[PDB]
């Protein structure tokens, strides 16, 4: 029957909770209370980036840390030159409803995918003057979210059908499928070292999956609702998670438990596109109250507010070198913020 | 003053050309009416799409009527959480909701009662607080033959009116309109469809014209 299996699963959950609680003598706040505070931050934006007429999801800069890929609901993919405010490429989209931006480590490919259940790879370095579709991937029964770029040939994606898929660029066939989530899967930041990846589902669960083995190894449940934001703390031993309520949680990888949560009584709206910095001191969260916030990922306290936006901030990202931070909202405006 | 480094002159000129193409595409899309198609089950969605298209994602319809390009999106092929992708369709010209009149007896709570909560969630949505909704009462011909044998008392326990189409349809429309709690800012255009005198496309055109007048009034000051 199934009653004994359910009882065994409950006992295993209790054992896992006991093991997690055993190694919880001290918290991050107690250790970090004896360090110098980050202090007030007055980061301001020096950019315009006015080329869109729809909601913006325009992150995943790239390794060169200057080019930008921008996807909106108008059905156009815009490649931005951040330094000079220039549009490099304007690729028409077959489907206007997309929520995905990727630039690939090589920079010669751009991934796009939304609720059309199609993932399109666009080749940038073509012998002609235009940008054409290099590979179309199908096999997902839900809206696409995140199109990370392991290599020039391997692309991992998440959809709303409670699964994740790794596809090959050369052959449009499935390679490795992860089926362990009970809800829609987004927030699939691709590690600092590309050998691993984690994904946050809609059932307040964040699960890590082996790229080669293709099996789940760790799960985290510390939220109370759907998760729509994941970073990976470029150190490689922790990752940040954001949910539809105004709270973020930092989960350690080796400890396998939530380290600390960042929340305030003055924030109630949602959270989208949580990303870290190149060192990890600053954690930037895109809230739904028409502005973004900066949190200290070490002690607890806030650091700054980025209020230079009109509509709800939907995407946020940082360059590889941490020179500047791109923020995009539904007001078809992209703001690039840099330190003083 | 920096001579713009020669090649960056051509780069910014290419940027201006891209901007020109972008604004041309935006102007073209601004004159395009976007309609959202919704339904509980079958709801006669296929029949309406097939009839009005000539007169696993989205089966988009780009039919034209009286120098107007209409966009229709069907999201019935997606089985996932609705609220995650429901904000992408905000700002549409109108939302088309189709409900079958012959669904007050069939189950899998009958189908129409299950459609009431979907209608409530769509009309009362925060993203759809300013978009007019066109309701279609499909299966009109089946209603005539399947109301005589099956009384309306099974569905509505608080109905005591005459067992006639002209009153039962009005009662169903009255409850469907009563599901709207934002009547002061939104309106519902209810229409009945049949396989004859196909004015459904004309009804959609009239509702689209009314909502365009509504929007232009907000843009042009008064209301």
């Amino acid at each position, epitope marked *: 029957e199934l009653d004994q299996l359910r009882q065994e699963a409950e006992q295993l959950k209790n054992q896992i909770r006991d093991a997690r609680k055993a190694c919880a003598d001290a918290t991050l706040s107690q250790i970090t209370n004896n360090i110098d505070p980050v202090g007030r931050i007055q980061m301001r934006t020096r950019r315009t980036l006015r080329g869109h007429l729809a909601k913006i999801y325009a992150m995943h800069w790239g390794t060169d840390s200057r080019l930008l890929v921008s996807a909106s609901q108008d059905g156009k993919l815009i490649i931005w*030159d951040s330094y000079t405010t*220039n549009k490099v490429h304007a690729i028409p989209l077959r489907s206007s409803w997309v929520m995905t931006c990727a630039y690939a480590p090589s920079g010669n490919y751009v991934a796009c995918g939304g609720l059309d259940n199609i993932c399109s790879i666009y080749n940038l370095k073509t012998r002609e*003057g235009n940008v054409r579709v290099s590979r179309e991937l199908a096999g997902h029964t839900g809206y696409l979210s995140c199109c990370r770029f392991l290599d020039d040939n391997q692309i991992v994606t998440s959809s709303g059908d409670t699964t994740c898929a790794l596809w090959d660029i050369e052959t449009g066939q499935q390679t490795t499928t992860f089926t362990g989530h009970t809800g829609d899967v987004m927030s699939l930041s691709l590690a600092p070292d590309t050998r691993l990846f984690v994904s946050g589902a809609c059932d307040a669960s964040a699960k890590l999956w082996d790229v080669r083995e293709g099996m789940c190894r760790q799960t985290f449940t510390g939220h109370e609702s759907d998760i729509n934001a994941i970073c990976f703390f470029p150190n490689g031993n922790a990752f940040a998670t954001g949910s539809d309520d105004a709270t973020c949680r930092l989960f350690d990888l080796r400890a396998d438990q939530e380290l600390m949560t960042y929340s305030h009584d003055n924030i109630i709206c949602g959270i989208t596109s949580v990303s870290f910095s190149k060192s990890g001191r600053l954690l930037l969260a895109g809230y739904d109250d028409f502005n973004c916030n900066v949190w200290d990922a070490l002690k607890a306290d806030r650091a700054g507010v980025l209020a230079g936006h009109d509509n709800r901030v939907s995407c946020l990202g940082v360059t590889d070198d941490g020179m500047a931070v791109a923020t995009g909202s539904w007001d078809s405006f992209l703001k690039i913020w840099n330190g003083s | 003053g920096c*001579t713009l480094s*020669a*090649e960056d002159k051509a*780069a910014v000129e290419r940027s201006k050309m891209i901007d020109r193409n972008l604004r041309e595409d935006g102007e073209k899309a601004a004159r395009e009416v976007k309609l959202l198609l919704l339904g509980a089950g079958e709801s006669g969605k296929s029949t309406i799409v097939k009839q009005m298209k000539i007169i696993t994602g989205i089966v988009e319809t780009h039919f034209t009527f009286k120098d107007l390009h209409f966009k229709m999106f069907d999201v019935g092929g997606q089985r996932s959480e609705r609220k995650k992708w429901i904000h992408c369709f905000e700002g549409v010209t109108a939302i088309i909701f189709c409900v079958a009149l012959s669904d007050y007896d069939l189950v899998l709570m009958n189908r129409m009662h299950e459609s009431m909560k979907l209608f409530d969630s769509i009309c009362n949505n925060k993203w759809f607080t300013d978009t007019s909704i066109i309701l279609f009462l499909n299966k009109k011909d089946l209603f005539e033959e399947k109301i005589k044998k099956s009384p309306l008392t099974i569905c509505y326990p608080e109905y005591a009116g005459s067992n006639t189409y002209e009153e039962a349809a009005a009662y169903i429309q009255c409850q469907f309109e009563d599901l709207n709690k934002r009547k002061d800012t939104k309106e519902i255009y209810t229409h009945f469809t049949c396989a004859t005198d196909t004015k459904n496309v004309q009804f959609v055109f009239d509702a689209v014209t009314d909502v365009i007048i509504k929007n232009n009034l907000k843009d042009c000051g008064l209301f």
Partner: single-chain antibody
Amino acid sequence: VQLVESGGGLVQPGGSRKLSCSASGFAFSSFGMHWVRQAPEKGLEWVAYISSGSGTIYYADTVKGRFTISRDDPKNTLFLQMTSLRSEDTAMYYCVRSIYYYGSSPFDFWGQGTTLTVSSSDIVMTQATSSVPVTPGESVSISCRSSKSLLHSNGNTYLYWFLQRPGQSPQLLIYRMSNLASGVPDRFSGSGSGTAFTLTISRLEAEDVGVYYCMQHLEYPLTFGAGTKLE
């Protein structure tokens, strides 16, 4: 991608003739076009250029106010019309394509060329060596000099290196003296600083001899080098 030109022949001085460069295999409307002339025995000489959409049109000093150029995207072709010709205009004309964005490769593809005969503050770019013997297997360095520092206040130099085989159209080898052109073997390399550039060929093989040309892109108004011949 293919560029084929027509309209050559022998023309009396003072006449008018037009050259048609028809493009087949790429996006002509998104590519700026240049016309570059080569004398039968002298070096390569710039003529004119027209941007995408006919926005910016430039002519060289010897040809300013006399020549005309035009484009038509639907027909995918380039016309250059020539009035009041002289005995100094007898040259092989090349129609070439160039695109201008971040990390682009202008002058990547050249045309086939047309033979035209007539019977009867600019930056100078000099090469110290005009001809040097070469052997299949040694490394050879070619030195390029400029009258002005090509390093602008943006972080990149505007060098271009072109190879002309004995009987083939010139092809780009390196651009901005920091990136290798597509389809070019890794043996070629370039380096140097403003006013003094070098190009190193290591593990030289056969079927690569020819004439090297050195191009600057600081201003418009681009001048070739003397041309280094290897044999």
